[PDB]
């Protein structure tokens, strides 16, 4: 009554079957990566087949490519001898074994929590190599031990995903106010901004309520209200990639020493912002279109690893500038069945 995903190998016909492409991330624990393999004997002695899960992290900037260096680290590597020529079976594994036959051999992994979610940095038009970001791979090798070089004639590769979804609890609603005292004696000026809630589903409008009470003789020239996205990187001491993904330079002149309150709407979306290379987007299987990065939440007690993406609405007032940052989180709701992992209409 269900379906799985299958990949094959030329020499050994090592048919790797996986229950799902993605694996949701509860903060306490990650859903298990459970699957099976059909391993027809294409040998007489090479009776070992190994399954390796690798949470690779690749990175490289424009000037890094110009100089000729790009970093890549294996955050987590797991090797299991799935064929006993341990790991008690599961329901889906049992159903697959009943379908498959005797040669079906299970393999089960668990991803330790707080590992970074599958987030890929958007490549530029010139960028054509392996995509930069956090990508999870499951591979199968038909060899003996690990002394033999991993031969492409036998290996099987599949790209999996680890993602998070918005919690039911909204959390504290973001809100921030700042009053600046100008150089003319101590004359204040108050700015306040508030959001609708803390978790926003991708594409939903953001109704930032902004109110300014100027206790001065000056005038507000313009109001730049933007949605900045910060993609911190926790390896090789790389800087914090900051990038505005939505904007509105709404100009409004307000009477000196007076009040003015209203709401400004901003919506992040990939249509207007498809050029800013290095932007963090959700996991791409094979260069497919994906939304922005799902804002990771380290609710556990935690360790900074991988790419930590977050979003904050920054409101700036000109004359220097009064700036206020309201952090929040952009993430999908809980899907019913699963994401299609591709554009829903293919072509």
């Amino acid at each position: 009554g269900t379906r799985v995903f299958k990949k094959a190998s030329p020499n050994g016909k090592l048919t790797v079957y996986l229950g799902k492409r993605d694996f949701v991330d509860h903060i306490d624990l990650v859903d298990p990566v459970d699957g099976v393999v059909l391993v027809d004997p294409e040998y007489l002695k090479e009776r070992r087949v190994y399954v390796t899960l690798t949470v690779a992290f690749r990175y490289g900037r424009e000037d890094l490519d110009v100089l000729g260096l790009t970093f890549r680290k294996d955050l987590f590597v797991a090797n299991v001898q799935s064929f006993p020529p341990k790991k008690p079976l599961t329901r889906l594994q049992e159903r697959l074994i009943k379908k498959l036959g005797e040669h079906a051999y299970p393999f089960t992994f668990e991803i330790p929590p707080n590992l970074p979610s599958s987030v890929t940095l958007q490549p530029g038009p010139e960028d054509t190599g392996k995509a930069l970001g956090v990508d999870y791979e499951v591979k199968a090798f038909v060899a003996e031990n690990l002394e033999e070089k991993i031969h492409k004639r036998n290996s099987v590769r599949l790209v999996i995903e680890k993602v998070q979804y918005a919690p039911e609890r909204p959390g504290p609603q973001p809100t921030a106010e700042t009053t600046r005292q100008f150089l003319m004696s101590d004359k204040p000026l108050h700015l306040e901004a508030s959001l609708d809630k803390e978790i926003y589903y991708h594409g939903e409008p953001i109704s930032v309520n902004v109110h300014v009470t100027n206790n001065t003789n000056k005038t507000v020239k313009k109001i730049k209200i933007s949605v900045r996205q910060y993609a911190d990187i926790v390896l090789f001491n790389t800087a914090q990639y900051k990038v505005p993904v939505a904007m509105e330079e709404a100009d409004d002149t307000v009477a000196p020493s007076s009040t003015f309150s209203k709401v400004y709407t901003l919506t992040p979306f990939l249509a207007n912002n498809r050029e800013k290379r290095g932007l963090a987007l959700d996991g791409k299987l094979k260069h497919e279109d994906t939304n922005l990065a799902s804002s990771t939440l380290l609710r556990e007690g935690r360790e900074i690893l991988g790419i930590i993406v977050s979003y904050k609405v920054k409101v700036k007032l000109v004359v220097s500038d009064v700036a206020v940052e309201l952090p929040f989180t952009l993430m999908h709701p809980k899907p019913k069945e699963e994401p299609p992992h591709r554009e829903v209409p293919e072509n």
Epitope: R3, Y201, H202, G203, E204, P205, T267, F269, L270, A271, N272, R274, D289, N291, H332, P335, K336, E337, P339, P340, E343, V344, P345, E346, N347
Partner: single-chain antibody, 222 residues
Framework: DIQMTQSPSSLSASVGDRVTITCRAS??????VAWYQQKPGKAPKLLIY???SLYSGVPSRFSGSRSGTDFTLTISSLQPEDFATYYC?????????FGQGTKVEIQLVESGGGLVQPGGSLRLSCAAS????????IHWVRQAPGKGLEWVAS????????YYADSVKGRFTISADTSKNTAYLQMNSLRAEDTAVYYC?????????????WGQGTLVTV
Amino acid sequence: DIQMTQSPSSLSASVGDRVTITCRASQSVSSAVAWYQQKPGKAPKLLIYSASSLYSGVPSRFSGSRSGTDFTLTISSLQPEDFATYYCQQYKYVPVTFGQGTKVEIQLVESGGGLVQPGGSLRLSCAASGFNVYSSSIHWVRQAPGKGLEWVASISSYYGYTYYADSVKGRFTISADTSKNTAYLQMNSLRAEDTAVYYCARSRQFWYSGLDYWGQGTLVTV
């Protein structure tokens, strides 16, 4: 494209029958199928999406089944309320070619149409209330008088994608005006080539759980 053979194309019976409607695809679509139902003078309402994932707001009589490349809709008890023309939408690939369309026998606002000159251009406005154009995907679907439903236009604002059928490529301009949270379709054609009734429709932007909401529509009669 991919064709949807819907055998049988005409099933009429009394109440209480477990009527089964099959739907065959020329190419594999991998459990990406939707089924609708519409009444005379009424826009359709989705019943099944994504291969037997029952849509909220309809009874549990209806069900689906991905039998190889064939998909089946089943009504256990043919209640008197279930007397409508049914269809078989597929959405795995582009276009969104529908099915044959079988009958059974015993706040979107689309405006800016009416009786049309033999040739020229028209503007059809779909005022979409209840969602943001970035959080939804706005489609436009036509039906000739007493004929099947065919996808006409589509806009996906979040990705900034504009889509039209291969047979209408260049003859329609779909746009998403976020100022009024509305959609606009500009037609530049002539004669009774496309004289029909046109429905605006909305779909969940991201995972596309079928075209959930449909407008009243108007008669574009040349």
